[PDB]
Amino acid sequence: RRLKQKNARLKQEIAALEYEIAALE
Amino acid sequence: EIDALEFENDALEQKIAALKQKIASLKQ
């Protein structure tokens, strides 16, 4: 389903960004 | 019905924009 796929990818993107934030600090 | 995942997806996008901004800031 469109919305479940976009949900899973929004989560993966937030994960990548919190990873970089932690690397940057 | 606006689905419960549209709610959750729209909150997740907000969160994304806010993390990008924080990363923009840490680099400055």
How does DSSP assign chain B, residue by residue? ---HHHHHHHHHHHHHHHHHHHHHHHH-
Instruction: Return the residue of A nearest to B9 by Cα.
Output: A7
> What radius of gyration do chain B's Cα atoms show?
12
Q: Does A15 touch chain B (CB under 8 A)?
A: no
The Cα–Cα gap between B20 and B26 comes to 10
From the CA of B5, how many Å to the nearest CA of chain A? 7
Cα B11 off chain centre by: 6
Q: What do you get for the CA distance between the two ends of chain B, in Å?
A: 42
Number of domains observed in the structure of chain A: 1
Strands (E), A1-25: none
Resolution of this structure in Å: 2.3
Contact of A9 with chain B, judged by CB distance below 8 Å, is answered with no
CB contact at 8 A, A20 and B23 = yes
Q: Could you tell me the sign of the dihedral formed by the alpha carbons of A15, A21, B27, B16, in that order? A: positive
The SS3 call for residue A17 is helix
CA–CA distance, B4 with A16 (Å, rounded to integer): 24
By Cβ distance, the residue of B5, B13, B27 closest to A4 is: B5
Experimental determination technique: X-ray
**Contact status, residue B9 vs residue A8, Cβ threshold 8 Å:** no
Dist CA B20 CA A13 (whole Å): 10
